[model samples]
Target chain A: RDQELEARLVELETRLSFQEQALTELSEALADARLTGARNAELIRHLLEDL
Target chain B: RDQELEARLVELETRLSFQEQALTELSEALADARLTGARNAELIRHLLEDL
Candidate 1:
Protein backbone atom coordinates (compact mmCIF):
# COMPACT_ATOMS: atom_id res chain seq x y z
CA ARG A 1 0.00 0.00 0.00
CA ASP A 2 2.88 2.35 0.72
CA GLN A 3 4.17 1.91 -2.84
CA GLU A 4 0.81 2.46 -4.49
CA LEU A 5 0.40 4.69 -7.53
CA GLU A 6 0.77 8.31 -6.48
CA ALA A 7 -0.59 9.76 -9.76
CA ARG A 8 -3.79 7.76 -9.58
CA LEU A 9 -4.25 8.74 -5.96
CA VAL A 10 -3.78 12.42 -6.85
CA GLU A 11 -6.43 12.22 -9.54
CA LEU A 12 -8.84 10.63 -7.10
CA GLU A 13 -8.03 13.32 -4.57
CA THR A 14 -8.86 16.07 -7.08
CA ARG A 15 -12.21 14.53 -7.97
CA LEU A 16 -13.05 14.00 -4.29
CA SER A 17 -12.23 17.63 -3.49
CA PHE A 18 -14.63 18.83 -6.16
CA GLN A 19 -17.32 16.47 -4.96
CA GLU A 20 -16.96 17.72 -1.39
CA GLN A 21 -17.29 21.34 -2.51
CA ALA A 22 -20.46 20.52 -4.42
CA LEU A 23 -21.83 18.70 -1.41
CA THR A 24 -21.16 21.68 0.87
CA GLU A 25 -22.86 24.12 -1.52
CA LEU A 26 -25.86 21.86 -1.88
CA SER A 27 -26.30 21.47 1.86
CA GLU A 28 -26.32 25.25 2.26
CA ALA A 29 -28.95 25.60 -0.47
CA LEU A 30 -31.21 23.08 1.22
CA ALA A 31 -31.01 24.99 4.50
CA ASP A 32 -31.93 28.20 2.70
CA ALA A 33 -34.95 26.52 1.15
CA ARG A 34 -36.21 25.51 4.59
CA LEU A 35 -35.71 29.01 6.01
CA THR A 36 -37.70 30.70 3.22
CA GLY A 37 -40.93 29.88 5.12
CA ALA A 38 -42.88 30.32 1.90
CA ARG A 39 -43.36 28.65 -1.43
CA ASN A 40 -42.74 31.77 -3.46
CA ALA A 41 -42.49 30.53 -7.03
CA GLU A 42 -40.43 33.41 -8.35
CA LEU A 43 -37.89 33.15 -5.59
CA ILE A 44 -37.68 29.42 -5.87
CA ARG A 45 -37.29 29.73 -9.61
CA HIS A 46 -34.38 32.10 -9.19
CA LEU A 47 -32.86 29.91 -6.53
CA LEU A 48 -32.81 26.88 -8.80
CA GLU A 49 -32.03 28.64 -12.07
CA ASP A 50 -28.28 28.22 -11.91
CA LEU A 51 -28.54 24.88 -10.17
CA ARG B 1 -20.85 -8.12 -25.85
CA ASP B 2 -24.19 -7.96 -24.04
CA GLN B 3 -22.63 -8.94 -20.72
CA GLU B 4 -19.92 -6.33 -21.12
CA LEU B 5 -22.47 -3.66 -22.00
CA GLU B 6 -24.73 -4.64 -19.13
CA ALA B 7 -21.89 -4.42 -16.63
CA ARG B 8 -20.88 -1.02 -17.93
CA LEU B 9 -24.47 0.16 -17.79
CA VAL B 10 -24.79 -0.97 -14.19
CA GLU B 11 -21.65 0.90 -13.22
CA LEU B 12 -22.94 3.99 -15.01
CA GLU B 13 -26.28 3.71 -13.27
CA THR B 14 -24.65 3.48 -9.85
CA ARG B 15 -22.53 6.54 -10.54
CA LEU B 16 -25.54 8.41 -11.94
CA SER B 17 -27.56 7.77 -8.79
CA PHE B 18 -24.85 9.26 -6.61
CA GLN B 19 -24.50 12.25 -8.93
CA GLU B 20 -28.25 12.85 -8.91
CA GLN B 21 -28.35 12.83 -5.12
CA ALA B 22 -25.46 15.28 -4.97
CA LEU B 23 -27.18 17.55 -7.48
CA THR B 24 -30.39 17.55 -5.49
CA GLU B 25 -28.56 18.40 -2.29
CA LEU B 26 -26.60 21.20 -3.98
CA SER B 27 -29.74 22.64 -5.52
CA GLU B 28 -31.32 22.87 -2.09
CA ALA B 29 -28.21 24.52 -0.61
CA LEU B 30 -28.08 27.08 -3.40
CA ALA B 31 -31.69 27.98 -2.74
CA ASP B 32 -30.92 28.51 0.95
CA ALA B 33 -27.91 30.69 0.22
CA ARG B 34 -29.97 33.04 -1.95
CA LEU B 35 -32.89 33.41 0.48
CA THR B 36 -30.66 34.41 3.38
CA GLY B 37 -28.76 36.81 1.07
CA ALA B 38 -25.87 35.19 2.81
CA ARG B 39 -22.36 36.24 1.92
CA ASN B 40 -19.18 34.36 2.63
CA ALA B 41 -18.66 36.37 5.75
CA GLU B 42 -22.14 35.59 7.00
CA LEU B 43 -21.58 31.96 6.27
CA ILE B 44 -18.31 31.99 8.13
CA ARG B 45 -20.04 33.72 10.99
CA HIS B 46 -22.76 31.11 11.01
CA LEU B 47 -20.20 28.34 11.12
CA LEU B 48 -18.32 30.03 13.93
CA GLU B 49 -21.54 30.63 15.82
CA ASP B 50 -22.42 26.99 15.45
CA LEU B 51 -19.15 25.97 16.97
Candidate 2:
Protein backbone atom coordinates (compact mmCIF):
# COMPACT_ATOMS: atom_id res chain seq x y z
CA ARG A 1 0.00 0.00 0.00
CA ASP A 2 2.76 2.31 -0.93
CA GLN A 3 4.02 4.74 1.75
CA GLU A 4 0.61 6.29 2.29
CA LEU A 5 0.03 4.47 5.56
CA GLU A 6 3.53 5.25 6.76
CA ALA A 7 2.35 8.05 9.02
CA ARG A 8 -0.82 6.34 10.27
CA LEU A 9 0.76 2.92 10.37
CA VAL A 10 3.00 3.94 13.21
CA GLU A 11 0.04 5.03 15.28
CA LEU A 12 -1.88 1.84 14.60
CA GLU A 13 1.22 -0.23 15.26
CA THR A 14 1.82 1.30 18.67
CA ARG A 15 -1.84 1.18 19.65
CA LEU A 16 -2.31 -2.41 18.54
CA SER A 17 0.89 -3.47 20.28
CA PHE A 18 0.00 -1.77 23.54
CA GLN A 19 -3.54 -3.09 23.56
CA GLU A 20 -2.32 -6.56 22.64
CA GLN A 21 -0.03 -6.59 25.65
CA ALA A 22 -2.78 -5.27 27.84
CA LEU A 23 -5.03 -8.03 26.56
CA THR A 24 -2.37 -10.67 27.23
CA GLU A 25 -1.74 -9.39 30.73
CA LEU A 26 -5.43 -9.32 31.49
CA SER A 27 -5.72 -12.88 30.24
CA GLU A 28 -2.95 -13.99 32.61
CA ALA A 29 -4.54 -12.18 35.52
CA LEU A 30 -7.75 -14.11 34.89
CA ALA A 31 -5.81 -17.36 34.76
CA ASP A 32 -4.22 -16.58 38.11
CA ALA A 33 -7.66 -15.90 39.57
CA ARG A 34 -8.60 -19.57 39.24
CA LEU A 35 -6.42 -20.41 42.23
CA THR A 36 -7.89 -17.64 44.27
CA GLY A 37 -11.45 -18.62 43.40
CA ALA A 38 -10.84 -22.28 44.06
CA ARG A 39 -9.05 -21.78 47.32
CA ASN A 40 -11.70 -19.44 48.71
CA ALA A 41 -14.54 -21.57 47.46
CA GLU A 42 -13.17 -24.63 49.19
CA LEU A 43 -12.67 -22.85 52.48
CA ILE A 44 -16.05 -21.22 52.32
CA ARG A 45 -17.67 -24.54 51.56
CA HIS A 46 -15.89 -26.39 54.32
CA LEU A 47 -16.49 -23.64 56.80
CA LEU A 48 -20.19 -23.67 56.03
CA GLU A 49 -20.40 -27.43 56.21
CA ASP A 50 -18.99 -27.83 59.74
CA LEU A 51 -21.90 -25.88 61.09
CA ARG B 1 -17.60 -19.49 59.33
CA ASP B 2 -16.44 -18.26 62.66
CA GLN B 3 -14.63 -14.96 63.25
CA GLU B 4 -11.30 -16.09 61.82
CA LEU B 5 -12.26 -15.58 58.24
CA GLU B 6 -13.94 -12.28 58.94
CA ALA B 7 -10.89 -10.24 57.96
CA ARG B 8 -9.90 -12.71 55.32
CA LEU B 9 -13.34 -12.44 53.76
CA VAL B 10 -12.96 -8.72 53.18
CA GLU B 11 -9.64 -9.20 51.50
CA LEU B 12 -11.08 -12.00 49.46
CA GLU B 13 -14.04 -9.88 48.57
CA THR B 14 -11.86 -7.09 47.28
CA ARG B 15 -9.57 -9.43 45.46
CA LEU B 16 -12.42 -11.25 43.81
CA SER B 17 -14.13 -8.02 42.88
CA PHE B 18 -11.02 -6.61 41.30
CA GLN B 19 -10.39 -9.81 39.43
CA GLU B 20 -13.98 -9.87 38.24
CA GLN B 21 -13.50 -6.41 36.77
CA ALA B 22 -10.29 -7.46 35.16
CA LEU B 23 -12.01 -10.47 33.67
CA THR B 24 -14.80 -8.33 32.32
CA GLU B 25 -12.36 -5.84 30.87
CA LEU B 26 -10.46 -8.64 29.23
CA SER B 27 -13.65 -9.92 27.65
CA GLU B 28 -14.26 -6.48 26.20
CA ALA B 29 -10.70 -6.26 24.99
CA LEU B 30 -11.01 -9.61 23.30
CA ALA B 31 -14.15 -8.46 21.58
CA ASP B 32 -12.34 -5.31 20.57
CA ALA B 33 -9.55 -7.38 19.16
CA ARG B 34 -12.01 -9.36 17.15
CA LEU B 35 -13.38 -6.17 15.70
CA THR B 36 -9.96 -4.77 14.95
CA GLY B 37 -8.85 -8.07 13.53
CA ALA B 38 -11.69 -8.18 11.04
CA ARG B 39 -11.15 -4.57 10.05
CA ASN B 40 -7.46 -5.10 9.52
CA ALA B 41 -8.00 -8.23 7.49
CA GLU B 42 -10.35 -6.31 5.22
CA LEU B 43 -7.91 -3.47 4.81
CA ILE B 44 -5.06 -5.86 4.14
CA ARG B 45 -7.12 -7.74 1.63
CA HIS B 46 -8.06 -4.55 -0.10
CA LEU B 47 -4.45 -3.42 -0.23
CA LEU B 48 -3.28 -6.79 -1.48
CA GLU B 49 -5.77 -6.58 -4.35
CA ASP B 50 -4.06 -3.43 -5.66
CA LEU B 51 -0.92 -5.46 -6.37
Candidate 3:
Protein backbone atom coordinates (compact mmCIF):
# COMPACT_ATOMS: atom_id res chain seq x y z
CA ARG A 1 0.00 0.00 0.00
CA ASP A 2 2.83 2.40 0.71
CA GLN A 3 4.43 1.57 -2.60
CA GLU A 4 1.18 2.27 -4.38
CA LEU A 5 0.90 5.62 -2.64
CA GLU A 6 4.45 6.52 -3.61
CA ALA A 7 3.85 5.67 -7.24
CA ARG A 8 0.72 7.77 -7.33
CA LEU A 9 2.53 10.72 -5.89
CA VAL A 10 5.25 10.47 -8.50
CA GLU A 11 2.67 10.30 -11.25
CA LEU A 12 0.86 13.33 -9.91
CA GLU A 13 4.08 15.32 -9.77
CA THR A 14 4.96 14.39 -13.32
CA ARG A 15 1.57 15.48 -14.58
CA LEU A 16 1.85 18.72 -12.65
CA SER A 17 5.04 19.58 -14.48
CA PHE A 18 3.41 19.00 -17.82
CA GLN A 19 0.41 21.05 -16.74
CA GLU A 20 2.67 23.97 -15.89
CA GLN A 21 4.33 23.80 -19.26
CA ALA A 22 0.97 23.76 -21.02
CA LEU A 23 -0.21 26.81 -19.08
CA THR A 24 2.89 28.74 -20.07
CA GLU A 25 2.51 27.87 -23.73
CA LEU A 26 -1.15 28.82 -23.75
CA SER A 27 -0.34 32.12 -22.06
CA GLU A 28 2.23 32.98 -24.72
CA ALA A 29 -0.20 32.08 -27.46
CA LEU A 30 -2.84 34.36 -25.98
CA ALA A 31 -0.36 37.23 -25.79
CA ASP A 32 0.56 36.78 -29.41
CA ALA A 33 -3.08 36.74 -30.43
CA ARG A 34 -3.72 39.99 -28.57
CA LEU A 35 -0.74 41.65 -30.25
CA THR A 36 -1.94 40.67 -33.68
CA GLY A 37 -5.44 41.77 -32.90
CA ALA A 38 -4.20 45.17 -31.84
CA ARG A 39 -2.20 45.63 -35.02
CA ASN A 40 -5.14 44.63 -37.16
CA ALA A 41 -7.39 47.05 -35.34
CA GLU A 42 -4.91 49.85 -35.95
CA LEU A 43 -4.74 49.07 -39.63
CA ILE A 44 -8.48 49.11 -39.92
CA ARG A 45 -8.65 52.50 -38.24
CA HIS A 46 -5.99 53.95 -40.53
CA LEU A 47 -7.75 52.74 -43.62
CA LEU A 48 -11.08 54.12 -42.45
CA GLU A 49 -9.54 57.52 -41.79
CA ASP A 50 -7.96 57.58 -45.21
CA LEU A 51 -11.22 56.57 -46.87
CA ARG B 1 5.61 7.57 8.32
CA ASP B 2 2.79 5.97 6.40
CA GLN B 3 0.33 8.49 7.76
CA GLU B 4 2.58 11.32 6.68
CA LEU B 5 2.83 9.84 3.22
CA GLU B 6 -0.93 9.53 2.98
CA ALA B 7 -1.41 13.17 3.96
CA ARG B 8 1.13 14.31 1.39
CA LEU B 9 -0.60 12.32 -1.29
CA VAL B 10 -3.89 13.96 -0.48
CA GLU B 11 -2.32 17.37 -0.71
CA LEU B 12 -0.82 16.54 -4.04
CA GLU B 13 -4.14 15.36 -5.36
CA THR B 14 -5.80 18.57 -4.26
CA ARG B 15 -3.19 20.64 -6.02
CA LEU B 16 -3.59 18.55 -9.12
CA SER B 17 -7.29 19.34 -9.22
CA PHE B 18 -6.60 23.06 -9.02
CA GLN B 19 -3.97 22.78 -11.75
CA GLU B 20 -6.44 21.09 -13.99
CA GLN B 21 -8.93 23.87 -13.41
CA ALA B 22 -6.34 26.49 -14.23
CA LEU B 23 -5.48 24.74 -17.45
CA THR B 24 -9.12 24.72 -18.47
CA GLU B 25 -9.54 28.43 -17.79
CA LEU B 26 -6.38 29.33 -19.70
CA SER B 27 -7.44 27.14 -22.60
CA GLU B 28 -10.74 28.96 -22.79
CA ALA B 29 -9.06 32.34 -22.66
CA LEU B 30 -6.77 31.36 -25.49
CA ALA B 31 -9.76 30.25 -27.53
CA ASP B 32 -11.46 33.57 -26.97
CA ALA B 33 -8.33 35.50 -27.94
CA ARG B 34 -7.99 33.55 -31.15
CA LEU B 35 -11.61 34.22 -32.04
CA THR B 36 -11.24 37.93 -31.50
CA GLY B 37 -8.03 37.98 -33.52
CA ALA B 38 -9.72 36.26 -36.41
CA ARG B 39 -12.53 38.75 -36.45
CA ASN B 40 -10.13 41.68 -36.34
CA ALA B 41 -8.16 40.27 -39.25
CA GLU B 42 -11.30 39.93 -41.30
CA LEU B 43 -12.23 43.55 -40.62
CA ILE B 44 -8.79 44.74 -41.64
CA ARG B 45 -9.00 42.95 -44.96
CA HIS B 46 -12.34 44.49 -45.74
CA LEU B 47 -11.10 47.96 -44.92
CA LEU B 48 -7.91 47.63 -47.01
CA GLU B 49 -9.87 46.35 -49.98
CA ASP B 50 -12.16 49.36 -49.82
CA LEU B 51 -9.22 51.74 -49.46
Model 2 residue B23 CA deviation (Å) reads 1.3
Worst 10 residues of 3 chain A by lDDT: A1-10
Model 1 chain B lowest lDDT segment of ten: B38-47
DockQ of each: 0.10, 0.02, 0.66
Per-chain TM-score (chain B), model 1 = 0.67
RMSD of each: 12.7, 25.1, 2.2
Model 3 C-alpha lDDT per residue in residues B1-51, reported as the tens digit of each score: 448878878898998999899789879978987987888798778868866
> lDDT per model, in order?
0.58, 0.58, 0.84
What is the C-alpha lDDT profile of model 1 across B1-51, one tens digit per residue? 335654654565567568867677767666666755545435544544555
Candidate No. with top TM-score: 3
User: 1 or 2, which is superior by TM-score?
Assistant: 2
Ranking by TM-score: 3, 2, 1
Q: Which segments of model 3 are wrong by more than 4 Å?
A: none
**Interface RMSD, all models, one decimal each?**
10.8, 22.7, 1.5
**Positional deviation of residue B1's Cα in model 1 after best superposition, in angstroms:** 30
Q: Best to worst by lDDT, what's the order?
A: 3, 2, 1
Clashing pairs in 1: A26-B26, A28-B29, A29-B28, A29-B29, A29-B30, A30-B28, A30-B29, A32-B32
